[PDB]
């Protein structure tokens, strides 16, 4: 019963590697922000019309996401085993998980003090309204907040945070993949590491059940990924939208 096997040198290495990768791609100071198109916040205490009409926050948020995408790609390119897939299976995994990972790593800036994401600087504080001004409806934004709170109350160790993202990326069930068995093998190595860290390092532990809760989020993420895709498609229907985006955002979601 309740065996708690010690972490293997290889498993330790993997975490070290993943931890380090994340430090090199996540900026907790948010210093690069002034290099994005400026936030514009029109008063819209509504309007789906004002919103689409203006799209005042889109250029800034499209810039952030785009920037983050780049940081997510850099992270993927440091997952052990990720180099060993055909670059074709790499892009497929990347594109189809890019938004899921962003929602995970944004939790580092999400604050349960006012249910927002703070990257600033009141300028770089993002509340529900700030995402509607970017042309989004409550069907995605409201479930997203709950996801972040559900995620916060897991009280994840940074070690578990980086592994969750690593697993999210290297999923063998994504549409378009060629070598599902190889991708599957890497995920098991990553998932096994997670279950083992939980057993060894997490207090009490009377609840290694934490693992079941973490896999559940990855399923929330699929819903959100699909919902986002719906809403993106509406934005692209809006004329002049393309310039408010970036060629990366356009490629990934189009
Ligand atoms: C992306 C991140 C941040 C916020 C993410 C947010 C806050 C605004 C609300 C966002 C942007 C959602 C919407 C759906 C994004 C929509 C994007 C378009 C309009 C293109 O579809 C999804 C993710 C949400 C900010 C911050 O928490 C993180 O980025 C910070 C920096 C990085 N990397 C670390 C410096 C994280 O990577």
From Swiss-Prot:
Binding site for calcitriol: 26, 68, 105, 109, 136, 228
Keyword Nucleus: yes
Predominant localisation class: nucleus
UniProt region (Interaction with coactivator LXXLL motif), positions on chain: 77-95
Keyword Membrane: no
Taxonomic placement: Eukaryota, Metazoa, Chordata, Craniata, Vertebrata
Molecular-function annotations in GO: bile acid nuclear receptor activity; calcitriol binding; DNA binding; DNA-binding transcription factor activity, RNA polymerase II-specific; lithocholic acid binding; nuclear receptor activity; nuclear retinoid X receptor binding; nuclear steroid receptor activity
Record note on what altering residue 105 to L does: In VDDR2A; loss of calcitriol receptor activity; decreased affinity for calcitriol by a factor of 1000; no effect on interaction with RXRA; changed interaction with NCOR1; loss of interaction with NCOA1; no effect on sequence-specific DNA-binding
Homology family: Belongs to the nuclear hormone receptor family. NR1 subfamily.
Domain NR LBD: 10-254
GO biological process, one term: vitamin D receptor signaling pathway
Keywords of the record: Cytoplasm, Disease variant, DNA-binding, Metal-binding, Nucleus, Receptor, Transcription, Transcription regulation, Ubl conjugation, Zinc, Zinc-finger
Subcellular location: Nucleus; Cytoplasm
Modifications made to the protein after synthesis: Ubiquitinated by UBR5, leading to its degradation: UBR5 specifically recognizes and binds ligand-bound VDR when it is not associated with coactivators (NCOAs). In presence of NCOAs, the UBR5-degron is not accessible, preventing its ubiquitination and degradation.
Subunit-structure text: Homodimer in the absence of bound vitamin D3. Heterodimer with RXRA after vitamin D3 binding. Interacts with MED1, NCOA1, NCOA2, NCOA3 and NCOA6 coactivators, leading to a strong increase of transcription of target genes. Interacts with the corepressor NCOR1. Interacts with SNW1. Interacts with IRX4, the interaction does not affect its transactivation activity. Interacts with CRY1. Interacts with CRY2 in a ligand-dependent manner.
Name of this protein: Vitamin D3 receptor
Domain of life: Eukaryota
A GO CC term assigned to this protein in UniProt: nucleus
Free-text comment on this protein's domains from its UniProt entry: Composed of three domains: a modulating N-terminal domain, a DNA-binding domain and a C-terminal ligand-binding domain. The 9aaTAD motif is a transactivation domain present in a large number of yeast and animal transcription factors.
Motif (9aaTAD): 247-254
């Amino acid at each position: 019963d309740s065996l708690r096997p010690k972490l293997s040198e290889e498993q330790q290495r993997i975490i070290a590697i993943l931890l380090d990768a994340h430090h090199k791609t996540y900026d907790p100071t948010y210093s690069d922000f002034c290099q994005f198109r400026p936030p514009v916040r029109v008063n819209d205490g509504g309007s789906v019309t004002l919103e689409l009409s203006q799209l005042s926050m889109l250029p800034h948020l499209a810039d952030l996401v785009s920037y983050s995408i780049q940081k997510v790609i850099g992270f993927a390119k440091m997952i052990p085993g990720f180099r060993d897939l055909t670059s074709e299976d790499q892009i497929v995994l990347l594109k189809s998980s890019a938004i899921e990972v962003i929602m995970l790593r944004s939790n580092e800036s999400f604050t349960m003090d006012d249910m927002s994401w703070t990257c600033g600087n009141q300028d770089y504080k993002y509340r529900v309204s700030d995402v509607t001004k970017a042309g989004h409806s409550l069907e995605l934004i409201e479930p997203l907040i709950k996801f972040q709170v559900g995620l916060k109350k897991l009280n994840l160790h940074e070690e578990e945070h980086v592994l969750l993202m690593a697993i999210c990326i290297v999923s063998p069930d994504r549409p378009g993949v060629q070598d599902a068995a190889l991708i599957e093998a890497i995920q098991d190595r990553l998932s096994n590491t997670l279950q083992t860290y939980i057993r060894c390092r997490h207090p009490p532990p009377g609840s290694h059940l934490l693992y079941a809760k973490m896999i559940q989020k990855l399923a929330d993420l699929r819903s959100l990924n699909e919902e986002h895709s719906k809403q993106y498609r509406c934005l692209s229907f809006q004329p002049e939208c393309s310039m408010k985006l970036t060629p990366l955002v356009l490629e990934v979601f189009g």
